[PDB]
């Protein structure tokens, strides 16, 4: 049977979590602001020559509900931690999302990928080397993405599947 992988997308409001997810699932780019409550998606993909099923939870970045993340952090197998490269605050929120995931999972070793989104925009405020250094100190991969141009979208989700797979085995 096909292996199912439970992925969760987290990050501050407006960084592009849903835009990335809808690019992966539906291959189109949502220009509009549609803040998420909670959404779930399914997609089968071929990764390293094997078909697998991605179950993707798109979560709310709305800062008011930070105390209600525990249930989905318990069930998720791997985490896409998204910031936007033109929003320094979203980059600083990353540390807090990661710690929260570690606290709920009670584990310092959780499949994760750091994602710097909106790399199509010129107004960059977070330096690539700064995110590379941060990811290196976490021991996790780092990928720059654009949900607008699709740059890195497949690679980010596929890399997280590879991380989860290494953790299961």
């Amino acid at each position: 049977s096909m292996t199912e992988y439970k992925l969760v997308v987290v990050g501050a409001g407006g960084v592009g979590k849903s835009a990335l997810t809808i690019q992966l699932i539906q291959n189109h780019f949502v220009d509009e602001y549609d803040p998420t409550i909670e959404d779930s998606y399914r997609k089968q993909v071929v990764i390293d020559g094997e078909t697998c099923l991605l179950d993707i939870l798109d979560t709310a970045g709305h800062e008011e509900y930070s105390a209600m993340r525990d249930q989905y952090m318990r069930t998720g197998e791997g985490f896409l931690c998204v910031f936007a490269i033109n929003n320094t605050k979203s980059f600083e929120d990353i540390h807090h999302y990661r710690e929260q995931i570690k606290r709920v999972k009670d584990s310092e070793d959780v499949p994760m990928v750091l994602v710097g989104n909106k790399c199509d925009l010129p107004s960059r405020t977070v330096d690539t080397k700064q995110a590379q250094d941060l990811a290196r100190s976490y021991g996790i991969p780092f990928i720059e993405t654009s949900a607008k141009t699709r740059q890195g979208v497949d690679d980010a989700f596929y890399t997280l599947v590879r991380e989860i797979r290494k953790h299961k085995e």
Partner: protein, 162 residues
């Protein structure tokens, strides 16, 4: 304080009429926006639009008449207008309050509470309350879900001022 009405339909079948008092004494600008959008007198408004987000236990949200997907809407003052005041609180079922995308982003989207939602106080402008037909709003919860997606099309078939 003016009174407006919505005639609600479920997949085109009548469900009944909900009426609202609009608190023009406390939030005159916000009340006038909703009143004018209910009559359609500016050439656009709520008639024909849907309730796109219904979460049982919390609220029914609608008013996106420009995009019909939860991302649109506009006020009679422009696409957005400022938070008028937060004098009134989300005290219980029937409160009518503005949806928004953060500070000073009111448009046309609104929500009707079906419970007390105290943590929204100071963040959403309360401007009205259900006068008659609260059980119709309760009945709209039958078509909602945990993330708000509706199982039938809940529309404002007609609306106006009483």
């Amino acid at each position: 304080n003016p009174t407006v009405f919505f005639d609600i339909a479920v997949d085109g079948e009548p469900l009944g009429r909900v009426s609202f008092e609009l608190f023009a004494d406390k939030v005159p600008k916000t009340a006038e926006n909703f009143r004018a959008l209910s009559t359609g007198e500016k050439g656009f408004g709520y008639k024909g639009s849907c309730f796109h987000r219904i979460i049982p236990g919390f609220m029914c949200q609608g008013g996106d008449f420009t995009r019909h997907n939860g991302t649109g809407g506009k006020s009679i003052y422009g696409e957005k207008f400022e938070d008028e005041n937060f004098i009134l609180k989300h005290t219980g079922p029937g409160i009518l309050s503005m949806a928004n995308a953060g500070p000073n982003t009111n448009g046309s989207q609104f929500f009707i509470c079906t419970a007390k939602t105290e943590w929204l106080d100071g963040k959403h402008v309360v401007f009205g309350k259900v006068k008659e037909g609260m059980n119709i709003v309760e009945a709209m919860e039958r078509f909602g879900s945990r993330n708000g997606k509706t199982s039938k099309k809940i529309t404002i078939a007609d609306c106006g001022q009483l």
